[PDB]
Enzyme design. Structure first.
Site, PDB file in Angstrom:
ATOM      1  N   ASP A   1       0.889  -1.253   0.020  1.00  0.00           N
ATOM      2  CA  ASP A   1       0.018  -0.026  -0.068  1.00  0.00           C
ATOM      3  C   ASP A   1       0.762   1.228  -0.065  1.00  0.00           C
ATOM      4  OD1 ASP A   1      -1.837  -1.912   2.343  1.00  0.00           O
ATOM      5  OD2 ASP A   1      -2.422  -1.476   0.204  1.00  0.00           O
TER       6      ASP A   1
ATOM      7  N   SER B   1       1.540   6.763   1.741  1.00  0.00           N
ATOM      8  CA  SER B   1       0.730   5.679   2.461  1.00  0.00           C
ATOM      9  C   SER B   1      -0.740   5.802   1.729  1.00  0.00           C
ATOM     10  CB  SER B   1       0.511   6.163   3.906  1.00  0.00           C
ATOM     11  OG  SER B   1       0.337   5.086   4.665  1.00  0.00           O
ATOM     12  N   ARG B   2      -1.027   4.761   1.032  1.00  0.00           N
ATOM     13  CA  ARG B   2      -2.189   4.528   0.390  1.00  0.00           C
ATOM     14  C   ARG B   2      -3.456   4.483   1.211  1.00  0.00           C
ATOM     15  NH1 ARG B   2       0.962   2.378  -3.012  1.00  0.00           N
ATOM     16  NH2 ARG B   2       0.761   2.247  -5.413  1.00  0.00           N
ATOM     17  N   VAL B   3      -3.238   4.143   2.406  1.00  0.00           N
ATOM     18  CA  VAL B   3      -4.259   4.198   3.422  1.00  0.00           C
ATOM     19  C   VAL B   3      -4.578   5.594   3.753  1.00  0.00           C
ATOM     20  CG1 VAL B   3      -4.868   3.491   5.657  1.00  0.00           C
ATOM     21  CG2 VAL B   3      -4.041   1.754   4.112  1.00  0.00           C
TER      22      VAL B   3
END
Ligand SMILES: Nc1ncnc2c1ncn2[C@@H]1O[C@H](COP(=O)(O)OP(=O)(O)OP(=O)(O)O)[C@@H](O)[C@H]1O
Ligand SMILES: Nc1ncnc2c1ncn2[C@@H]1O[C@H](COP(=O)(O)OP(=O)(O)O)[C@@H](O)[C@H]1O
Ligand SMILES: [Mg+2]
Ligand SMILES: [Mg+2]
Lengths: 281, 210, 365, 177, 277, 70, 105, 52, 52
Positions: A192, A217-219
């Site tokens: 992610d 941070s893809r979250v």
């Protein structure tokens, strides 16, 4: 800048001796400090898989984890450099199976695969000696599937399945900041986020040498501290303004004296993000 | 095994011990380089095998400095402290005055400002570079070669600008008494008896730059 | 615990561990045999234990040079006093076939492992070119019917090297301080035989070719050499902050070199000119003469103690020596001697000639 | 009364004692002019050298036979071996005669020195020839300058300078041949 | 890593055409400012033969002006006269005098503070942006007579040719604060002249040295501006060579990497084919 | 225009176009070293300007809209 | 190009003449011989030429010489691939070349 | 490079190509604005070599 | 950059000598005379050295 939720795989990629283990060790040491303060349900049990490392390097880490007290929560799965290539290929999966005990029974895990790049070299050794035909840099065809099989086991489960989680930290070594390499580009596609660590940032004094413009941070801020979600958005933007004004005053051509304010404050901010090793905050 | 191709070959160039006869074999491998790239594969293999290099620069060869010996990169550490004792006296100053000449020419080749101390170096450096360039198929004996560098690292050539130094060398080596080459050959080095004798013969040579 | 080598750039920036693995990384002529003979000269006499020199695939002339220079040093004693020797030599040099060069590192460790395991003492293992172990297995692996790996090496490069390097350790019964020269092919540090070795070492001393072309010897890259001993809890905070401050100005100078090449130093800020002035000074101060290089450089060699290294570079970082020119720092021992050499440089610029006559050159005396 | 024996040649010898020895001496404006004042000569009988300058132009540097200069006492004329003179000039017409032919520049004021060697050095700011002046807008602003005199004591002088300039400019367009 | 070396050839090729454009931008600006620096050279000549040239006087108060550039690709021109500032600002102080250090040009305040920050009191900049005029050089001079020193020092680079810029110190003494006091030896050197002024000789010399201040200031920042374009021209020639020498080493490095990746991709293809055949 | 060539060349040009395109390719060739200096418009050389403005008069000439050939 | 050699070798060895031989694009000789090695299943060398590149050129270029009978002089056009003089096809060719004539626009 | 500046969606405005960008498909007042916007963004990239 | 009559008379002596050397390397060819009119010139070696 790059905050990590529970159930998210995050890459620590960088060159050699840029501090990739130190980011990973400080995640393990900090969980011990946090596990003494939280209730029993939300405690993070770390697993550190050391693939292809020295045995002395591993004995230095279990010495640090015993001295800090982090060994009460840590499993140390060690496939050193003298082990057979199927023991280093298989050690990420065996450590993930130990870490998935905590995910499957409602608790929280933290798996660190230190050098997935050394797992792929051990998997290339077995593939080439089982006479599987080689591909890019003599790697097998299914080396994307080697790491996507492993890293997709880091999940955040439903409340029907316990609510447990497993957070993965693959470590990938690049060669000269060459993230365009074959195994590095596979794992950037799988994980992610990404924590890119730089060599010239390391020696400038900025260590942990986090490339803030390349680290994702893809979250995102959906799973970060609310007391820093409102504070670090100012910090994310003021460092974004810091970068281009430092590229031009590298030359020394002219001054605007209003871009000199953002060059002054971000230099405090870059100095703010520095940290000593083995002391997580 | 292309390293072992060359390493097992050049290892046969040895100096044998005295119970094996004392014989020797000295090798000169030649490696052609593409665009000056010394970090190629076969070039760096033979550098790891051999004892020194003689780098021949394309840019010095185009300027007419022939042999185009890259002085800063050419090494011989096994052959140093095995050389002519007379040449070892005069070439320590020659390597050094060329070491300063490369270092001073590194600072300012275009006319920003010229010190009088550094224009001594560019005057002595261009003196010694024209001294060392020689023409083909006429190798010089080592006693005529010591005297010619003795006449250049010391005084005896600062009158000539840069142009007639090639003609000043045969003005030096033919006009000195040819007995002074016989004592320097047979002793091996410059004795203090021959030292000021050779200062005396180098003051009565007539130099073409006047 | 630290291993004091007497070398400035080593003891400051990448200090060696007394029971650890040390690698000297080099690219064919940059100086990793002179450095490994200097460590034999500095460390291996004040060590008080046995040494093993495993020569793996290097020159036979160098094997004869070390053997003869150890006899005149008394490290090797011949005849009836053989038992008072401190070094044993295992040689598999570059005229050997690739099977002999692929195994001679293993018989050099076996001699070193006996002193560690059975005799129970501290060994110094010096392996000259552990790359030639990897290269000799790569010559063989083509003929064992293997599919080749990346650049052209054996598929088993990491485990062949791993199985050898994991034997070279300090155990609970004895110690092996291992210094290994590592050749890098075509100056490529991403070549898989140098790249695999980096993980096996506690201290890597990377020698660069561009550093050697500026005349700086030992040609150690200060921003590519690394120790695990550079840790403030291991070497102390005064040592650690000097090493990190030396690396910080050398790195910020490297960030400037693109502009200094094009625009020159005239376009720099004078804050940045103080960087270029200081970082040119410590770049020269990291070099030093060697007691094994005096036989071809003429300059006698200087052992610099660790306390003189730390205080000397701390003075240049705080600014106590911005007076002196940048060539006074070149090839000197400690900060006492840059002041000794700067005085000589000033004195020479005044007194240069007036040696006409009434010297020993009289034509009759 | 002679406490400081200064000069260009003295400054070289003392500056080698305080500056670094790397730097050579700065140049001086005496090193760029070859014509002096007390240096004897430079008259040559009839025609004398006239250096009529502005900040932005060198309007003449060849020799003339007479210069009608508009001094503040009145218009005077210079012949070759004239007395040494430092003359502040009014706004008026400098007449450069060479013989039968004469060129008439109207200047704004600014000094004119006659040096002891007969060199005339007229030094004005704006030196317009009367061919490029028009006689219409001169009184269009002079009538305005004859009206606007407030109690501003700085404009007491600036209007006085405005009036006397156009008034001499009125009278010096009328008598042209 | 074969695109990082290809994007550096993108950089050095654009720099080597920026710096060759700035070479001829400064070359055409050197020529149309030479037609203004030669016309202005005349008017400084009568004041140096009327008042002479006295650099080393023991003034009680001095104003020293180091006139520099505004833009800074000049190549060490603004530093050589900052170096020549203290070479004359340590020389002429034999008695502990007041000195007001002034800088014309924005590159002067950043370099004179490095030497004298306690005597630096004025900063003129934005001078050469449209052009340099005498009314502008008059206003700079009138701000210098608010302070009244006994002497003025103007430090500038004299544009001699396109190659040589020998710096000049041009000195102006205050009208009888030292000026007649240096001529009066066994009489006077100024008493040869018959004063035709309205008021006194001490009053016309007050008018005459302000005019001598404004003239040699107008020449200074016109000599220096034409000396700036001719050192930027020699600086932007030395950087197109440096961006051609760097571009040549990058193209040799790119061709080596181009040949090496064709060999590498081919060895990968033959190894995969030999594993099946 | 610098990289597009034709080895047949102008022997298969329309004559009449060969009269006027022979100097078109020259005026564009001189423009190409003078191009990318056109961001210096405030700073000018006035013979470099004539090849600079005419060079932009000609590249604007050779533009076309598709599916309408001339 | 060997058929061109053989015609020029008759004039050299039987007629006894000073023959000119124009090998128009010696690079396309290299390029064609590199294709026939690739079709014969040979492993390509560095950048991708045949393993026999120096002996495919040297077999042709050594028949162009001066004998005691006459001479063959070869004026052969050289293409430099990717403007790279260190490419192995011009670099192997330039070891044989005794002069260059550069025609410029 | 568009994403690193903070422009989101990080669409390269020059490299994005469509077949609906013909004037006889989307009209002239959409085609000329799109070709006008791309001309100003292309010119800025040719000046950003000299601004930086 | 500077001008033609800017530089020295000896540097102009080379320019006059080089330009009539750069012209003198031209030569009309005997195979080109069927479409150029100018006859061909075979120039001998001694006449080339002594001419230059
Ligand atoms: N945040 C930090 N502050 C100070 N020093 C650090 C920090 N992180 C790492 N270091 C030092 O830098 C060195 C390199 O760190 P580390 O071992 O973590 O790198 P790495 O990425 O694991 O390298 P590798 O696995 O390739 O050896 C270590 O010796 C450590 O002491
Ligand atoms: N410390 C040093 N001092 C002086 N010269 C050196 C030093 N190290 C290397 N050199 C020079 O570089 C050469 C490198 O030789 P060596 O050390 O044998 O190289 P390698 O690293 O290939 O073994 C030496 O012969 C010497 O001339
Ligand atoms: Mg690690
Ligand atoms: Mg060696």
């Amino acid at each position: 800048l790059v905050p990590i939720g529970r159930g998210q795989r995050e890459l620590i990629i960088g060159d050699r001796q840029t501090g990739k283990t130190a980011v990973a060790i400080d995640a393990i040491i900090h969980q011990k400090n946090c596990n003494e303060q939280v209730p029993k349900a939300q405690r993070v049990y770390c697993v550190y898989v050391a693939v292809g490392q020295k045995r002395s390097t591993v004995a230095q880490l279990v010495k640090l984890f015993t001295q800090t007290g982090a060994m009460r929560y840590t499993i140390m799965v060690s496939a050193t450099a003298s082990d057979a290539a199927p023991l280093q290929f298989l050690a990420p999966y065996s450590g993930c199976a130990m870490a998935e005990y905590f995910r499957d029974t409602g608790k929280h895990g933290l798996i660190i695969y230190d050098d997935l790049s050394k797992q792929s070299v051990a998997y290339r050794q077995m593939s080439l000696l089982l006479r599987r035909p080689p591909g890019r840099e003599a790697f097998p065809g299914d080396v994307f599937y080697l790491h996507s099989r492993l890293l997709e086991r880091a999940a955040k489960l439903s409340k029907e399945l316990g609510g447990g989680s497993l957070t993965a930290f693959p470590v990938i070594e690049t060669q000269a900041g060459d993230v365009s390499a074959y195994i590095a580009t596979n794992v950037i596609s799988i994980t992610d986020g990404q924590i890119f660590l730089e060599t010239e940032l390391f020696y400038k004094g900025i260590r942990p040498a986090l490339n803030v413009g390349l680290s994702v941070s893809r979250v995102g801020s959906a799973a970060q501290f609310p007391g820093m979600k409102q504070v670090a958005g100012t910090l994310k933007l003021e460092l974004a303004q810091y970068r281009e004004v430092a590229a031009f005053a590298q030359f020394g051509s002219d001054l605007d004296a209003a871009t000199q304010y953002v060059l002054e404050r971000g230099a405090r901010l870059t100095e703010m993000l520095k940290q000593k090793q083995f002391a997580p905050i | 095994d292309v390293f072992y191709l060359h390493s097992r070959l050049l290892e046969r160039a040895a100096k044998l011990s005295k119970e094996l006869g004392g014989g020797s074999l000295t090798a000169f491998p030649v490696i052609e380089t593409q665009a000056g790239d010394v970090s190629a594969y076969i070039a760096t293999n033979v550098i790891s095998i051999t004892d020194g290099q003689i780098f021949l620069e394309t840019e010095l060869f185009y300027k007419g400095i022939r042999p185009a010996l890259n002085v800063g990169l050419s090494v011989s550490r096994v052959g140093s402290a095995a050389q002519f004792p007379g040449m070892k006296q005069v070439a320590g100053t020659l390597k050094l005055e060329l070491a300063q000449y490369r270092e001073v020419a590194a600072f300012a080749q275009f006319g920003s400002d010229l010190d009088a101390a550094t224009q001594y170096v560019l005057e002595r450096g261009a003196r010694l570079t024209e001294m060392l360039k020689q023409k083909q198929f006429a190798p010089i004996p080592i006693e005529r070669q010591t005297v010619a560098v003795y006449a250049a690292t010391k005084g005896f050539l600062d009158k000539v600008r840069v142009q007639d130094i090639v003609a000043a060398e045969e003005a030096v080596i033919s006009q000195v008494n040819p007995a002074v080459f016989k004592i320097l050959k047979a002793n091996g080095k410059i004795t203090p008896a021959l030292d000021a004798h050779l200062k005396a013969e180098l003051r009565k040579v007539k130099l073409p730059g006047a | 615990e630290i291993l004091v080598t007497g070398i400035k750039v080593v003891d400051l920036l990448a200090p060696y561990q007394r029971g650890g693995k040390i690698g000297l990384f080099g690219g064919a002529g940059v100086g990793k045999t002179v450095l490994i003979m200097e460590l034999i000269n500095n460390v291996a006499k004040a060590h008080g234990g046995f040494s093993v020199f495993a020569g793996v695939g290097e020159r036979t002339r160098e094997g004869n040079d070390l053997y003869r220079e150890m006899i005149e040093s008394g490290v090797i004693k011949l005849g009836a006093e053989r038992g008072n020797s401190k070094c044993t030599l295992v040689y598999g040099q570059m005229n050997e076939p690739p099977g002999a060069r692929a195994r001679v590192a293993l018989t050099g460790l076996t001699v070193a492992e006996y002193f560690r395991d059975i005799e129970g003492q501290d060994v110094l293992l010096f392996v000259d070119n552990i790359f030639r172990f990897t290269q000799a297995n790569s010559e063989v692996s083509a003929l064992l019917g293997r599919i080749p790996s990346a650049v052209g090496y054996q598929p088993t490069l990491a485990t062949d090297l791993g199985g050898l390097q994991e034997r070279i350790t300090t155990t609970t019964k004895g110690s092996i301080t291992s210094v290994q020269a590592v050749y890098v092919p075509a100056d490529d540090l991403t070549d898989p035989a140098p790249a695999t070795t980096f993980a096996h070492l506690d201290a890597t001393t990377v020698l660069s070719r561009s550093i050697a072309e500026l005349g700086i010897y030992p040609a150690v890259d200060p921003l590519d050499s690394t120790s695990r001993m550079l840790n403030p809890n291991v070497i102390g905070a005064e040592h650690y902050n000097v090493a990190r401050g030396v690396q910080k100005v050398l790195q910020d100078y490297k960030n400037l070199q693109d502009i200094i090449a094009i625009l020159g130093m005239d376009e720099l800020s004078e804050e940045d000119k103080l960087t270029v002035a200081r970082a040119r000074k410590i770049q020269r101060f990291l070099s030093q003469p060697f007691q094994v290089a005096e036989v071809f450089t003429g300059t006698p060699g200087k052992y610099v103690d660790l306390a003189d290294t730390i205080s000397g570079f701390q003075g240049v970082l705080t600014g106590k020596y911005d007076d002196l020119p940048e060539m006074a720092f070149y090839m000197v021992g400690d900060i006492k001697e840059v002041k000794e050499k700067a005085d000589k440089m000033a004195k020479d610029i005044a007194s240069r000639k007036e040696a006409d006559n009434k010297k020993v050159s009289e034509e009759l005396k | 009364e002679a406490a400081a024996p200064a000069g260009p040649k003295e400054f070289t010898e003392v500056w080698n004692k305080k500056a670094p020895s790397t730097l050579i001496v700065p140049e001086f404006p005496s090193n760029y002019t070859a014509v002096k004042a007390v240096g004897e000569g430079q008259v040559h009988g009839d025609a004398f050298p006239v250096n009529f300058y502005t900040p932005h132009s060198i309007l003449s540097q060849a020799q003339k036979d007479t210069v009608v200069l508009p001094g503040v006492d009145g218009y005077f004329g210079v012949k070759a071996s004239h007395v040494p003179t430092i003359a502040q000039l009014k706004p008026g017409v400098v007449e450069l005669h060479s013989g039968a032919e004469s060129e008439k520049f109207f200047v704004s004021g600014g000094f004119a020195f006659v040096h002891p060697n007969g060199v005339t050095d007229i030094c004005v700011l704006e030196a317009a020839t009367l061919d490029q002046v028009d006689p219409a807008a001169v009184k269009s602003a002079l009538a305005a300058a004859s009206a606007a005199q407030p109690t501003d004591e700085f404009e007491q002088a600036a209007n006085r300078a405005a009036i006397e300039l156009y008034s001499a400019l009125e009278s010096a367009v009328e008598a042209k041949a | 890593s074969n695109q990082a070396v290809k994007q550096r050839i993108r950089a050095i090729k654009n720099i080597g055409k920026i710096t060759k454009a700035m070479k001829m931008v400064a070359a055409s600006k050197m020529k149309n400012a030479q037609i203004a620096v030669e016309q202005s050279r005349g008017l400084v000549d009568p004041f140096v033969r009327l008042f002479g040239d006295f650099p080393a006087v023991n003034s009680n108060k001095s104003v020293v002006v180091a006139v520099t550039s505004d833009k800074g690709l000049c190549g060490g021109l603004n530093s050589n006269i900052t170096k020549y500032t203290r070479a004359t600002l340590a020389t002429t102080e034999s008695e502990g005098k007041d000195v007001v250090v002034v800088s014309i040009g924005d590159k002067g305040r950043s370099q004179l503070t490095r030497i004298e920050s306690q005597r630096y009191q004025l900063a003129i900049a934005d001078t050469y942006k449209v052009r340099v005029t005498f009314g502008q050089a008059s206003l700079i001079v009138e701000e210098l007579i608010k302070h009244n020193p006994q002497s003025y020092q103007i430090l500038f680079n004299k544009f001699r040719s396109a190659i040589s810029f020998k710096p000049t110190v041009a000195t102006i003494l205050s009208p009888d604060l030292l000026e007649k006091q240096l001529e009066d030896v066994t009489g006077n050197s100024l008493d040869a002249y018959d004063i035709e002024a309205s008021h006194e000789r001490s009053d016309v010399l007050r008018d005459l040295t302000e005019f001598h201040l404004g003239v040699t200031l107008y020449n200074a920042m016109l000599e220096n501006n034409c000396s700036e374009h001719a050192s930027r021209m020699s600086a932007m020639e030395n950087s197109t060579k440096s961006a051609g020498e760097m571009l040549g080493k990058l193209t040799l490095d790119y061709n080596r990497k181009r040949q090496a990746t064709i060999t590498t991709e081919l060895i990968e293809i033959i190894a995969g084919a030999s594993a099946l055949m």
